[PDB]
Amino acid sequence: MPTPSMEDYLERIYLLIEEKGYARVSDIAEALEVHPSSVTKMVQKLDKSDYLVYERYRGLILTAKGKKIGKRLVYRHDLLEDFLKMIGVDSDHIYEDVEGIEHHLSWDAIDRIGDLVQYFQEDPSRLNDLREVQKKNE
Amino acid sequence: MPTPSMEDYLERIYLLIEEKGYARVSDIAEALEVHPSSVTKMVQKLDKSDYLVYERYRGLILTAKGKKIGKRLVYRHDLLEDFLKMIGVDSDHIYEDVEGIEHHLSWDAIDRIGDLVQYFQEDPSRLNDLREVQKKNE
Ligand SMILES: [Mg+2]
Ligand SMILES: [Mn+2]
Ligand SMILES: [Mn+2]
């Protein structure tokens, strides 16, 4: 039911509190380089759906549901960056390829990439074999 | 330089040409599920910049440029489809996942995914190991 950009907002709020203990509307406007009225409108939609609350001095506060979604997206980003690093995507492309995947892949597929990432680490000689395949191509 | 929309046309045109020598406007409309008048507008755009030619009583044939692009696009769709099958995504999620991400991955990542698919092809017992990780992880 939440749009991808609603989820990205919860992820950003969780990481703002990780960085300094608070999430402000002004923080999000400055980072996205948008007008603060679009942020307060997004905050309003997230508030009405019970993902966050707002109190003027503490700022933006995640609910149990909002904090669960925000953490999940941080870890999705990690998992997919691990995947793309493992298979050899270069540093110029990996970031936009992670943002590309994470917005257009079902959660079933994300889970399967998580199994794959686990597969290459339970016996790391699998990863050396994969890199041999790349070198003999190269 | 070609837009996502052009890439979806060029890929379908290549498949039909691959099967039949020419791509008819009516088969393109059917496959992409758009109104024939949309195809015409795209056909006129792609004709004007030399991706294709319209031949009377035949349909569309790609130029060297359009065919090079269209062949690469079909390779991308087919490689991603194999990739998702291989890591076990539900057969109900596959076409829509592929149509999703295919416009959002660099060619660098497509090549590395190709290295990954080749890694599993060169010793298919690696697919059985991968399946054990997934059954265990559950
Ligand atoms: Mg992100
Ligand atoms: Mn496609
Ligand atoms: Mn597509």
Author numbering:
A (entry chain A), B (entry chain B): 1 to 138
What does the paper say about this structure?
Mn2+-bound BhMntR crystals were obtained by soaking with 50 mM MnCl2 for one hour in apo crystals. The crystal structure of the Mn2+-bound form was determined at 2.5 Å resolution, and the binuclear manganese ions were clearly evident in the 2Fo-Fc map and omit maps, whereas a magnesium ion was observed in the other subunit. The two manganese ions were found at the interface between the HTH domain and the dimerization domain and formed a binuclear complex separated by 4.5 Å, labeled as the A and C sites (AC conformer). The binuclear manganese ions were liganded by six amino acid residues: Asp8 and Glu11 contributed by domain 1, and His 77, Glu99, Glu102, and His103 contributed by domain 2. The MnA ion was coordinated by seven atoms: Glu11 Oε1/Oε2, His77 Nδ1, Glu99 Oε2, Glu102 Oε1/Oε2, and Wat95 O. In addition, the His77 Nε2 made a hydrogen bond with Glu81 Oε1, while the His77 Nδ1 in the other subunit made a hydrogen bond with Glu81 Oε1 via a water molecule. The Mnc ion was coordinated by five atoms: Asp8 Oδ1, Glu99 Oε1, Glu102 Oε2, His103 Nε2, and Wat37 O, while the C site of BsMntR has octahedral coordination geometry. However, the other subunit contained a magnesium ion which was coordinated by the side chains of Glu99, Glu102, and two water molecules. The side chain of His77, which is strictly conserved in the MntR/IdeR family, had a different rotamer with a hydrogen bond via a water molecule to Glu81 and was also stabilized by π-π interaction with symmetry-related Tyr57. These interactions could block the proper rotamer of His77 to coordinate with MnA ion in this subunit. There were few structural differences between apo and Mn2+-bound dimeric forms, with a r.m.s.d. value of 0.49 Å for 276 Cα atoms.
The manganese transport regulator (MntR) functions as a homodimer and is activated by Mn2+ to repress the expression of two manganese uptake systems, MntABCD and MntH, in response to elevated concentrations of Mn2+. The MntR homologue (BH2807, BhMntR) in Bacillus halodurans is a protein consisting of 139 amino acids, and has 78% sequence identity with MntR from B.subtilis (BsMntR). Each BhMntR subunit was composed of seven α-helices and two β-strands, which could be divided into an N-terminal Helix-Turn-Helix (HTH) DNA binding domain (domain1, residues 1–71) and a C-terminal dimerization domain (domain2, residues 72–139). To further understand the metal binding site of the MntR protein, we determined crystal structures of the apo and manganese-bound forms of MntR from B. halodurans.
